């Protein structure tokens, strides 16, 4: 059906993590196949790489994997296949990666980097889980008990083994791990093998003898069956090791150990002869000690040479310096330092006459001094007479040479034999496991640390044998030349083995590899699995290589490996690469009763009432995506990995901790008996099986043997005594563990609490799904210390039954036989008085213990959340979709944003945003506010957060979610959506209270998820389909777009208002601006595809037309100030972009309002007939606007006052506005009225600014005459078409101006007045006064302007025209100009106000700062430096355009040789817009702030996310839509 | 850039679309009409056995005009 898993990349191709579960590994799910599927009927599972759209690795990006195409192709672990990505800079690529066979695959990406080279990222690897069953039933991984077997222990014939068989079935283990079943070597020791490609010949003969045994075991007990593999070692007498002697280390292979080979036969040649002097033979005294390192000191130590095996041969080289004074006996350089400083003389030789391999160790001589290039240097120094002193001054220089290598001898040396005195003493006087047995031909003093052989070549070698260094790095090969532990005898060895040496690959030992590979191809035919004793001293491209060659014999190969490397991290990749399916860990290594708590609870679970993932804001939800109406579309035979909610959106993958197979004890640690006590066998059995893991035990810890048995010498074998011990126990432990393994899956469907008092250890196991759930007490004796009590247990709305308990006695000591292996006579009585306590009231269950509960004693209890049935899951993920059927885009803002004042409009100031208790309130009173705070929590899952606490403290919260809805409830779709979560809501505080955060995240959750998908179905494709990031701009759109009851755009009714931000624009006159409203109407409403809410807004602002102008302020019908003179051109542009965009928009010229003011500039009628009076065509709303300005405007402010604008002086109320039409272009404005978008009229009388603007844009703004030209442009072709009636426009002294010549009159002025020519050259056409300049190469920020110097000042308002009206701007003057806003005034996310290198620039805007400064105090800075957002916007648009025409480097050739951007362009692009991702990823705020200080700091005051700053950015996204993606 | 109909203009760079139906056996043809005398050009792309896009060279005819 589907088994589809989604891992989504970073934008540097890594993988990213959806939880926080640790250092971890790509791990997918066990599952079985579907109903009656086997390997290669369909894919195992299908990972879909999802890769960010416009990302560095896009670029010519290629994704490399080694896994096969299909299942016809074999593995190869080096053969990678190509993928391509499908780059976009809006929709995100999805490739495929289909899996029919479980093993290791690794993927990397290759792409073009930024220096037009090739790179390549890390090799990211993830693990599919061999499927593991019997006969015909699945057997989970989680539910695994073994049962490890040794084989020289169960009886010389087959059928003495099939009595340890039916035994274990009995305790119903379901997995039996075997010791290697080979021929064993000489001491007998099952991993020192003395043959790997046959079995043991006392027992078996042939393959089909064991084969028939192991599907015997399958069969007749359903027991599956695994062996050791031993890679690291073989017997030390193997027939094969004489013809094949350089599979090991050996003095031809690995020279550097010929000095450990000497010392060693120093020592079998030493203890041969030992007491023969042998002073103090074996005796346990401090005289004794000291005396057998003296004769260590003379007979060995200064019996071999001084060891010149680091010491240059100080004599033997002046012997060969006379001999050779003739040959090459010159130094050109100079470099040779004097003999003042004899050490940097001494090193210089080194590095100059040296033979290859100088300083390390090899033959006796290995280290050695280049003599012709010595001698070329010592007549260079001193003289090229010999006699002169040579013999002085080379044996000086060569004894300082020594002086290193003589202190790397008496540290070797120290350690050599302070290892020796230490090891021997601990095997005779040391009294912690002693044994003086008299230095005998088989135990010498020295444990053999080289097995010496005659070989059948002809020849005598000595290969070492392995160990393992103390606490030496065992990812360190201490037996290759990078390790000294064989010479500083830091080794303990295993005589039984010896080396095997693995090189690079088959090329360093060609009969290893092939022996090896038909050694581990043979147990794979047989057995399900293999165990690594070890493995983190196997070589990873050694454990690599072989284990693949198992799983092409057996797919479903189960691996286990004793992994302790240096850190968790490598250990996850051993784990990766290898394809490791279980860790190995011990239960008793925990010294005490909290390290036993600890190690249970690490592989236990996750706590209950843990957090359940959900996709939120940070993920894409397209609108043409499959759904399941309500959760139905599975089927349990299908075995599909399910899917979070209704929405297809496939399970993630991410990194979880390795699958742990818990030993309560293995076959090398020490007995219950031997550690602790006998009694504790019960208690620590228990607590392990209690795990949520594979769990598994050694044959003997259940018939609690006395002492650990002894591999290498025992040959007693198995006692025939059944059900003694824990067999009866281990037998309900395994059967309880059958029936949870049915329903359990992934990690968060398990949760665990574990609890440490004293000696009592609690678990309680808990199914997240159904609510069942194991309850656990067990009394540990690790000592005898004492009676202790148990305090009260108290579960919180649960109720518990007793299933059972026991209590595990000593009956006496073990029997002492010298065939059989018998174990300590234990009583195993019931126990009862358990009081099960429930108040049918608070729903709460009590536990009291009795009195007889000794140590070594459990009990379990059967118990049961209550509320939560298994139906409970269904309930919650369904019915979402279809309750947000009937939403808009309009009711969508009630449901997810709501600001706090918007909220307070609605409810008249009663309500508002909920109070979360030592936090504050959410951003937003809807679903938003709550999804931005918890996709934190989920991720990290911080049940301490203070909205987790106040979950289970209260449902305070649960019903302010539905509360919140009756606000709103009249509105379309919110009805049904309320509903929803009411029903939801309700059965959620049935719940235990610690259940509720958990359950409350989700419920939020899905339905956030439903209504942000349920946006993109209504918006356009563009946006339906892209990256996360454009969707999150698009979501702006509904923040901003909301009905309110305060305020609206028309004065009749209430209907849908764009606000300007949230929070501090949005309710009563400060909601709607003009000027802001049609900056932000294409990006907002026209990209997203609002095409009907577009035209309200362009209707209801046409009806308040007075002046020739749009209002600043609109209040919907009412006092509309009038203090702009950019509104109605950014309202002009957007009639062109609403008829440029929406099909059929030519409409919209001829629809007819209802002009509520007079045709003149006369006053305010609210309540006359004026208010009717006459219709208005938007076609004649146009012109009026292109003809009053031209015939010139003057009119001072109504009402003006203190009634108006509490600041502004006298003189600023009367505004006037003219056209030159030398240039056509419009003038207007005075240092007294702040009429442009740098609005800021001062306000501080501690700095004497009240009325005086902080930034006065008089005269001709460049964002003003652009949209001229925008216009003038759009009507003259308007005219083309029969759709503009008008073709004259009047000026002030009455003569008539043809369109088409006021168009050519900006056409050939617009540029020559404001464009600042970069050479001085040409200064006397575009007329610059030269004294007040700032930079060349800049367009004019203002014309005749009343500041001088704010003519020439660098602001982001040129890239205003640049991007309307492209055709007043040569391509070169544009893009050398653009380019130096890029590097000047573009700021990380918003874009500089003014240049930097200005003297009036303040980048730092604090409105309420009471001070002294014209600029800082009462945040006159608001246009002076700080960095605003929408103006990055129409930056980057004609940043695009403009390099998309002049660089040839940002064109490549398109389809039908049409030229699209290069990805060159692109990437810069995308670069320029990373900043802005982050912001709105982690702000609380949905959206993009308004401002912004210097370099990005956070301005307090700006508001957190506004229209305009988001809408901008949309238009960009929609440039390189329209017109590129076809 | 042969227009698609007599009521669109011609340009020299705006080149329309033509599916190419491939097959083993049997060759395709794809007619082109011409409505207005003047200079007409056709190219072809098609994915190269690099996987890649490729094109050939811009193949011209006249149509003459009518006296
Ligand atoms: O009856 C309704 C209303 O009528 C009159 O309104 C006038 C104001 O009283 C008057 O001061 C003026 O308001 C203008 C201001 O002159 C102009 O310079 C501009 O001001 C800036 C602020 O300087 C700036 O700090 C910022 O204000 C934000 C602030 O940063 C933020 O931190 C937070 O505090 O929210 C503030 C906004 O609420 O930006 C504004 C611009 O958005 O624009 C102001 C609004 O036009 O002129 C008004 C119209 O005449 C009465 O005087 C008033 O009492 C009545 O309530
Ligand atoms: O919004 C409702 C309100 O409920 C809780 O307030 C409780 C709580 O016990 C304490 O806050 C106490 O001081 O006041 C109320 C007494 O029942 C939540 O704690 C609070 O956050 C929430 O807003
Ligand atoms: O002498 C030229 C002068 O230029 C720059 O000064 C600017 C000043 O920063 C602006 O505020 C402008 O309006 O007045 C000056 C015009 O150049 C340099 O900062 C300055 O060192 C230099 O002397």
């Given at each position: 059906?589907?088994?589809?898993?989604?891992?989504?990349?970073?934008?540097?191709?890594?993988?990213?993590?959806?939880?926080?579960?640790?250092?971890?590994?790509?791990?997918?799910?066990?599952?079985?196949?579907?109903?009656?599927?086997?390997?290669?009927?369909?894919?195992?599972?299908?990972?879909?790489?999802?890769?960010?759209?416009?990302?560095?690795?896009?670029?010519?990006?290629?994704?490399?994997?080694?896994?096969?195409?299909?299942?016809?192709?074999?593995?190869?672990?080096?053969?990678?296949?190509?993928?391509?990505?499908?780059?976009?800079?809006?929709?995100?690529?999805?490739?495929?990666?289909?899996?029919?066979?479980?093993?290791?695959?690794?993927?990397?990406?290759?792409?073009?980097?930024?220096?037009?080279?090739?790179?390549?990222?890390?090799?990211?690897?993830?693990?599919?889980?061999?499927?593991?069953?019997?006969?015909?039933?699945?057997?989970?991984?989680?539910?695994?008990?073994?049962?490890?077997?040794?084989?020289?222990?169960?009886?010389?014939?087959?059928?003495?083994?099939?009595?340890?068989?039916?035994?274990?079935?009995?305790?119903?283990?379901?997995?039996?791990?075997?010791?290697?079943?080979?021929?064993?070597?000489?001491?007998?020791?099952?991993?020192?093998?003395?043959?790997?490609?046959?079995?043991?010949?006392?027992?078996?003969?042939?393959?089909?003898?064991?084969?028939?045994?192991?599907?015997?075991?399958?069969?007749?007990?359903?027991?599956?069956?695994?062996?050791?593999?031993?890679?690291?070692?073989?017997?030390?007498?193997?027939?094969?090791?004489?013809?094949?002697?350089e599979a090991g280390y050996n003095h031809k292979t690995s020279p550097h150990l010929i000095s450990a080979i000497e010392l060693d036969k120093k020592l079998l040649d030493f203890s041969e002869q030992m007491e023969a002097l042998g002073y103090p033979v074996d005796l346990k005294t401090v005289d004794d000690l000291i005396k057998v390192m003296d004769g260590i000191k003379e007979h060995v130590i200064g019996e071999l040479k001084l060891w010149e095996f680091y010491v240059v041969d100080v004599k033997q080289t002046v012997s060969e310096l006379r001999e050779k004074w003739g040959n090459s006996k010159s130094w050109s350089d100079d470099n040779i330092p004097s003999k003042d400083d004899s050490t940097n003389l001494a090193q210089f030789?080194?590095?100059?006459?040296?033979?290859?391999?100088?300083?390390?160790?090899?033959?006796?001589?290995?280290?050695?001094?280049?003599?012709?290039?010595?001698?070329?240097?010592?007549?260079?120094?001193?003289?090229?007479?010999?006699?002169?002193?040579?013999?002085?001054?080379?044996?000086?220089?060569?004894?300082?040479?020594?002086?290193?290598?003589?202190?790397?001898?008496?540290?070797?040396?120290?350690?050599?034999?302070?290892?020796?005195?230490?090891?021997?003493?601990?095997?005779?006087?040391?009294?912690?496991?002693?044994?003086?047995?008299?230095?005998?031909?088989?135990?010498?003093?020295?444990?053999?640390?080289?097995?010496?052989?005659?070989?059948?070549?002809?020849?005598?070698?000595?290969?070492?044998?392995?160990?393992?260094?103390?606490?030496?790095?065992?990812?360190?090969?201490?037996?290759?030349?990078?390790?000294?532990?064989?010479?500083?005898?830091?080794?303990?060895?295993?005589?039984?083995?010896?080396?095997?040496?693995?090189?690079?690959?088959?090329?360093?030992?060609?009969?290893?590899?092939?022996?090896?590979?038909?050694?581990?191809?043979?147990?794979?035919?047989?057995?399900?699995?293999?165990?690594?004793?070890?493995?983190?001293?196997?070589?990873?491209?050694?454990?690599?290589?072989?284990?693949?060659?198992?799983?092409?014999?057996?797919?479903?190969?189960?691996?286990?490996?004793?992994?302790?490397?240096?850190?968790?991290?490598?250990?996850?990749?051993?784990?990766?690469?290898?394809?490791?399916?279980?860790?190995?860990?011990?239960?008793?290594?925990?010294?005490?009763?909290?390290?036993?708590?600890?190690?249970?609870?690490?592989?236990?679970?996750?706590?209950?009432?843990?957090?359940?993932?959900?996709?939120?804001?940070?993920?894409?939800?397209?609108?043409?995506?499959?759904?399941?109406?309500?959760?139905?579309?599975?089927?349990?035979?299908?075995?599909?990995?399910?899917?979070?909610?209704?929405?297809?959106?496939?399970?993630?993958?991410?990194?979880?901790?390795?699958?742990?197979?818990?030993?309560?004890?293995?076959?090398?640690?020490?007995?219950?008996?031997?550690?602790?006590?006998?009694?504790?066998?019960?208690?620590?059995?228990?607590?392990?099986?209690?795990?949520?893991?594979?769990?598994?035990?050694?044959?003997?810890?259940?018939?609690?043997?006395?002492?650990?048995?002894?591999?290498?010498?025992?040959?007693?074998?198995?006692?025939?005594?059944?059900?003694?011990?824990?067999?009866?126990?281990?037998?309900?432990?395994?059967?309880?563990?059958?029936?949870?393994?049915?329903?359990?899956?992934?990690?968060?469907?398990?949760?665990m609490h574990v609890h440490h008092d004293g000696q009592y250890i609690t678990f309680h196991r808990t199914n997240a799904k159904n609510g069942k759930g194991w309850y656990l007490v067990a009394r540990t004796k690790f000592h005898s210390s004492g009676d202790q009590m148990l305090p009260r247990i108290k579960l919180s709305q649960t109720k518990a039954t007793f299933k059972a308990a026991f209590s595990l006695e000593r009956t006496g000591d073990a029997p002492i036989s010298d065939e059989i292996i018998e174990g300590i006579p234990t009583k195993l009585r019931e126990l009862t008085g358990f009081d099960i306590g429930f108040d049918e009231n608070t729903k709460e269950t009590s536990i009291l213990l009795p009195q007889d509960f000794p140590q070594g004693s459990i009990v379990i209890f059967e118990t049961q959340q209550l509320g939560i049935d298994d139906s409970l899951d269904?309930?919650?993920?369904?019915?979402?979709?279809?309750?947000?059927?009937?939403?808009?885009?309009?009711?969508?803002?009630?449901?997810?944003?709501?600001?706090?004042?918007?909220?307070?409009?609605?409810?008249?100031?009663?309500?508002?945003?909920?109070?979360?208790?030592?936090?504050?309130?959410?951003?937003?009173?809807?679903?938003?506010?709550?999804?931005?705070?918890?996709?934190?929590?989920?991720?990290?899952?911080?049940?301490?957060?203070?909205?987790?606490?106040?979950?289970?403290?209260?449902?305070?919260?649960?019903?302010?979610?539905?509360?919140?809805?009756?606000?709103?409830?009249?509105?379309?779709?919110?009805?049904?959506?309320?509903?929803?979560?009411?029903?939801?809501?309700?059965?959620?505080?049935?719940?235990?209270?610690?259940?509720?955060?958990?359950?409350?995240?989700?419920?939020?959750?899905?339905?956030?998820?439903?209504?942000?998908?349920?946006?993109?179905?209504?918006?356009?494709?563009?946006?339906?389909?892209?990256?996360?990031?454009?969707?999150?701009?698009?979501?702006?759109?509904?923040?901003?777009?909301?009905?309110?009851?305060?305020?609206?755009?028309?004065?009749?009714?209430?209907?849908?208002?764009?606000?300007?931000?949230?929070?501090?624009?949005?309710?009563?006159?400060?909601?709607?601006?003009?000027?802001?409203?049609?900056?932000?109407?294409?990006?907002?409403?026209?990209?997203?595809?609002?095409?009907?809410?577009?035209?309200?807004?362009?209707?209801?602002?046409?009806?308040?037309?007075?002046?020739?102008?749009?209002?600043?302020?609109?209040?919907?019908?009412?006092?509309?100030?009038?203090?702009?003179?950019?509104?109605?051109?950014?309202?002009?542009?957007?009639?062109?972009?609403?008829?440029?965009?929406?099909?059929?928009?030519?409409?919209?010229?001829?629809?007819?309002?209802?002009?509520?003011?007079?045709?003149?500039?006369?006053?305010?009628?609210?309540?006359?007939?004026?208010?009717?009076?006459?219709?208005?065509?938007?076609?004649?709303?146009?012109?009026?606007?292109?003809?009053?300005?031209?015939?010139?405007?003057?009119?001072?402010?109504?009402?003006?006052?203190?009634?108006?604008?509490?600041?502004?002086?006298?003189?600023?109320?009367?505004?006037?506005?003219?056209?030159?039409?030398?240039?056509?272009?419009?003038?207007?404005?005075?240092?007294?009225?702040?009429?442009?978008?740098?609005?800021?009229?001062?306000?501080?009388?501690?700095?004497?600014?009240?009325?005086?603007?902080?930034?006065?844009?008089?005269?001709?703004?460049?964002?003003?005459?652009?949209?001229?030209?925008?216009?003038?442009?759009?009507?003259?072709?308007?005219?083309?078409?029969?759709?503009?009636?008008?073709?004259?426009?009047?000026?002030?002294?009455?003569?008539?101006?043809?369109?088409?010549?006021?168009?050519?009159?900006?056409?050939?002025?617009?540029?020559?007045?404001?464009?600042?020519?970069?050479?001085?050259?040409?200064?006397?056409?575009?007329?610059?006064?030269?004294?007040?300049?700032?930079?060349?190469?800049?367009?004019?920020?203002?014309?005749?302007?009343?500041?001088?110097?704010?003519?020439?000042?660098?602001?982001?308002?040129?890239?205003?025209?640049?991007?309307?009206?492209?055709?007043?701007?040569?391509?070169?003057?544009?893009?050398?100009?653009?380019?130096?806003?890029?590097?000047?005034?573009?700021?990380?996310?918003?874009?500089?106000?003014?240049?930097?290198?200005?003297?009036?620039?303040?980048?730092?805007?604090?409105?309420?700062?009471?001070?002294?400064?014209?600029?800082?105090?009462?945040?006159?800075?608001?246009?002076?430096?700080?960095?605003?957002?929408?103006?990055?916007?129409?930056?980057?648009?004609?940043?695009?355009?403009?390099?998309?025409?002049?660089?040839?480097?940002?064109?490549?050739?398109?389809?039908?040789?049409?030229?699209?951007?290069?990805?060159?362009?692109?990437?810069?692009?995308?670069?320029?817009?990373?900043?802005?991702?982050?912001?709105?990823?982690?702000?609380?705020?949905?959206?993009?702030?308004?401002?912004?200080?210097?370099?990005?700091?956070?301005?307090?005051?700006?508001?957190?996310?506004?229209?305009?700053?988001?809408?901008?950015?949309?238009?960009?996204?929609?440039?390189?839509?329209?017109?590129?993606?076809?």
């Amino acid at each position: 059906a589907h088994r589809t898993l989604l891992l989504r990349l970073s934008d540097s191709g890594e993988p990213v993590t959806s939880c926080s579960y640790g250092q971890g590994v790509l791990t997918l799910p066990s599952l079985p196949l579907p109903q009656g599927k086997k390997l290669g009927d369909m894919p195992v599972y299908t990972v879909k790489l999802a890769i960010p759209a416009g990302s560095p690795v896009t670029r010519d990006g290629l994704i490399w994997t080694n896994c096969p195409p299909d299942f016809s192709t074999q593995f190869d672990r080096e053969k990678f296949y190509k993928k391509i990505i499908k780059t976009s800079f809006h929709e995100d690529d999805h490739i495929d990666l289909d899996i029919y066979v479980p093993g290791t695959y690794c993927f990397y990406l290759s792409f073009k980097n930024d220096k037009d080279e090739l790179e390549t990222t890390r090799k990211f690897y993830f693990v599919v889980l061999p499927i593991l069953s019997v006969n015909d039933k699945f057997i989970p991984l989680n539910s695994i008990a073994m049962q490890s077997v040794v084989s020289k222990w169960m009886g010389p014939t087959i059928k003495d083994w099939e009595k340890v068989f039916a035994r274990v079935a009995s305790k119903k283990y379901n997995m039996i791990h075997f010791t290697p079943l080979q021929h064993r070597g000489e001491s007998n020791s099952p991993y020192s093998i003395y043959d790997q490609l046959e079995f043991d010949p006392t027992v078996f003969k042939s393959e089909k003898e064991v084969a028939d045994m192991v599907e015997r075991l399958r069969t007749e007990h359903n027991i599956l069956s695994l062996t050791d593999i031993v890679f690291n070692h073989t017997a030390n007498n193997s027939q094969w090791l004489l013809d094949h002697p350089e599979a090991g280390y050996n003095h031809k292979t690995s020279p550097h150990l010929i000095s450990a080979i000497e010392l060693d036969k120093k020592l079998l040649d030493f203890s041969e002869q030992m007491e023969a002097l042998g002073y103090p033979v074996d005796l346990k005294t401090v005289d004794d000690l000291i005396k057998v390192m003296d004769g260590i000191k003379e007979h060995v130590i200064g019996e071999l040479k001084l060891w010149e095996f680091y010491v240059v041969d100080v004599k033997q080289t002046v012997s060969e310096l006379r001999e050779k004074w003739g040959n090459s006996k010159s130094w050109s350089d100079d470099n040779i330092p004097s003999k003042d400083d004899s050490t940097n003389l001494a090193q210089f030789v080194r590095d100059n006459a040296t033979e290859p391999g100088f300083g390390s160790l090899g033959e006796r001589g290995s280290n050695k001094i280049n003599i012709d290039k010595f001698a070329a240097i010592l007549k260079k120094l001193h003289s090229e007479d010999y006699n002169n002193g040579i013999e002085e001054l080379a044996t000086k220089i060569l004894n300082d040479i020594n002086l290193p290598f003589y202190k790397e001898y008496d540290d070797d040396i120290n350690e050599v034999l302070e290892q020796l005195f230490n090891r021997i003493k601990y095997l005779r006087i040391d009294d912690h496991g002693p044994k003086q047995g008299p230095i005998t031909k088989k135990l010498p003093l020295s444990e053999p640390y080289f097995t010496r052989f005659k070989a059948k070549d002809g020849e005598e070698y000595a290969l070492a044998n392995n160990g393992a260094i103390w606490d030496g790095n065992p990812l360190v090969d201490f037996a290759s030349s990078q390790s000294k532990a064989y010479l500083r005898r830091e080794v303990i060895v295993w005589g039984d083995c010896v080396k095997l040496r693995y090189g690079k690959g088959p090329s360093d030992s060609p009969y290893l590899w092939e022996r090896m590979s038909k050694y581990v191809e043979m147990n794979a035919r047989i057995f399900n699995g293999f165990r690594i004793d070890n493995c983190h001293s196997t070589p990873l491209h050694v454990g690599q290589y072989f284990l693949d060659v198992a799983r092409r014999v057996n797919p479903n190969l189960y691996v286990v490996a004793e992994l302790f490397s240096g850190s968790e991290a490598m250990d996850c990749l051993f784990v990766e690469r290898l394809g490791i399916s279980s860790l190995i860990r011990e239960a008793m290594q925990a010294w005490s009763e909290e390290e036993l708590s600890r190690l249970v609870h690490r592989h236990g679970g996750r706590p209950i009432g843990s957090y359940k993932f959900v996709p939120l804001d940070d993920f894409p939800y397209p609108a043409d995506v499959k759904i399941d109406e309500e959760y139905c579309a599975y089927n349990p035979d299908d075995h599909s990995v399910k899917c979070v909610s209704e929405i297809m959106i496939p399970k993630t993958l991410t990194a979880t901790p390795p699958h742990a197979l818990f030993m309560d004890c293995t076959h090398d640690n020490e007995t219950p008996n031997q550690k602790r006590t006998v009694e504790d066998t019960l208690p620590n059995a228990a607590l392990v099986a209690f795990c949520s893991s594979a769990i598994g035990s050694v044959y003997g810890y259940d018939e609690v043997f006395p002492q650990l048995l002894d591999l290498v010498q025992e040959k007693r074998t198995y006692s025939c005594a059944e059900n003694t011990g824990i067999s009866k126990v281990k037998t309900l432990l395994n059967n309880m563990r059958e029936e949870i393994a049915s329903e359990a899956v992934d990690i968060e469907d398990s949760e665990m609490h574990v609890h440490h008092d004293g000696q009592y250890i609690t678990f309680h196991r808990t199914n997240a799904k159904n609510g069942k759930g194991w309850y656990l007490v067990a009394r540990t004796k690790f000592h005898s210390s004492g009676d202790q009590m148990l305090p009260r247990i108290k579960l919180s709305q649960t109720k518990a039954t007793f299933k059972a308990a026991f209590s595990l006695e000593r009956t006496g000591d073990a029997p002492i036989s010298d065939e059989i292996i018998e174990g300590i006579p234990t009583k195993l009585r019931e126990l009862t008085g358990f009081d099960i306590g429930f108040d049918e009231n608070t729903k709460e269950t009590s536990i009291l213990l009795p009195q007889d509960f000794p140590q070594g004693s459990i009990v379990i209890f059967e118990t049961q959340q209550l509320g939560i049935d298994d139906s409970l899951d269904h309930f919650i993920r369904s019915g979402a979709i279809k309750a947000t059927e009937k939403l808009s885009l309009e009711s969508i803002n009630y449901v997810l944003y709501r600001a706090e004042q918007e909220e307070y409009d609605y409810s008249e100031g009663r309500s508002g945003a909920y109070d979360i208790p030592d936090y504050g309130k959410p951003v937003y009173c809807g679903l938003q506010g709550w999804v931005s705070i918890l996709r934190k929590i989920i991720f990290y899952n911080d049940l301490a957060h203070p909205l987790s606490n106040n979950l289970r403290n209260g449902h305070w919260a649960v019903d302010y979610v539905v509360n919140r809805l009756d606000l709103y409830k009249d509105k379309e779709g919110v009805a049904e959506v309320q509903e929803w979560l009411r029903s939801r809501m309700e059965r959620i505080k049935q719940l235990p209270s610690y259940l509720v955060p958990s359950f409350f995240a989700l419920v939020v959750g899905i339905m956030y998820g439903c209504c942000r998908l349920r946006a993109m179905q209504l918006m356009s494709d563009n946006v339906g389909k892209s990256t996360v990031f454009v969707q999150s701009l698009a979501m702006t759109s509904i923040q901003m777009v909301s009905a309110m009851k305060s305020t609206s755009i028309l004065p009749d009714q209430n209907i849908a208002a764009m606000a300007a931000g949230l929070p501090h624009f949005s309710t009563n006159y400060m909601r709607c601006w003009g000027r802001d409203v049609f900056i932000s109407l294409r990006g907002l409403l026209l990209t997203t595809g609002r095409y009907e809410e577009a035209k309200e807004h362009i209707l209801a602002f046409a009806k308040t037309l007075k002046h020739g102008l749009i209002p600043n302020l609109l209040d919907a019908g009412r006092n509309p100030r009038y203090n702009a003179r950019d509104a109605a051109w950014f309202f002009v542009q957007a009639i062109q972009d609403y008829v440029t965009i929406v099909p059929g928009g030519v409409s919209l010229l001829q629809e007819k309002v209802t002009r509520r003011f007079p045709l003149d500039d006369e006053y305010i009628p609210y309540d006359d007939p004026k208010a009717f009076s006459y219709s208005s065509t938007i076609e004649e709303i146009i012109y009026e606007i292109l003809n009053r300005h031209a015939g010139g405007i003057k009119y001072r402010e109504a009402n003006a006052g203190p009634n108006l604008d509490r600041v502004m002086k006298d003189e600023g109320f009367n505004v006037e506005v003219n056209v030159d039409w030398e240039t056509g272009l419009i003038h207007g404005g005075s240092q007294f009225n702040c009429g442009t978008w740098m609005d800021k009229m001062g306000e501080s009388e501690k700095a004497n600014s009240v009325g005086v603007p902080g930034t006065p844009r008089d005269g001709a703004a460049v964002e003003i005459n652009g949209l001229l030209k925008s216009c003038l442009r759009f009507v003259l072709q308007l005219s083309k078409d029969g759709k503009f009636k008008y073709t004259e426009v009047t000026k002030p002294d009455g003569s008539k101006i043809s369109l088409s010549s006021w168009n050519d009159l900006l056409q050939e002025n617009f540029e020559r007045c404001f464009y600042v020519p970069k050479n001085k050259e040409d200064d006397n056409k575009f007329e610059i006064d030269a004294t007040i300049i700032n930079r060349r190469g800049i367009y004019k920020d203002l014309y005749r302007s009343g500041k001088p110097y704010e003519d020439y000042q660098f602001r982001p308002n040129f890239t205003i025209a640049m991007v309307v009206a492209p055709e007043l701007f040569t391509p070169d003057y544009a893009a050398g100009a653009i380019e130096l806003a890029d590097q000047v005034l573009r700021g990380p996310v918003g874009m500089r106000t003014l240049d930097p290198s200005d003297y009036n620039y303040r980048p730092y805007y604090n409105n309420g700062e009471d001070s002294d400064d014209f600029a800082t105090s009462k945040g006159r800075n608001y246009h002076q430096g700080p960095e605003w957002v929408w103006c990055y916007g129409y930056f980057i648009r004609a940043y695009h355009y403009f390099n998309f025409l002049t660089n040839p480097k940002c064109q490549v050739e398109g389809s039908a040789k049409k030229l699209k951007p290069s990805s060159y362009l692109y990437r810069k692009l995308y670069s320029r817009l990373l900043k802005h991702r982050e912001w709105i990823e982690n702000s609380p705020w949905a959206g993009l702030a308004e401002l912004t200080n210097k370099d990005g700091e956070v301005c307090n005051d700006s508001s957190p996310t506004q229209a305009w700053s988001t809408g901008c950015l949309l238009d960009l996204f929609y440039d390189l839509w329209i017109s590129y993606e076809e």
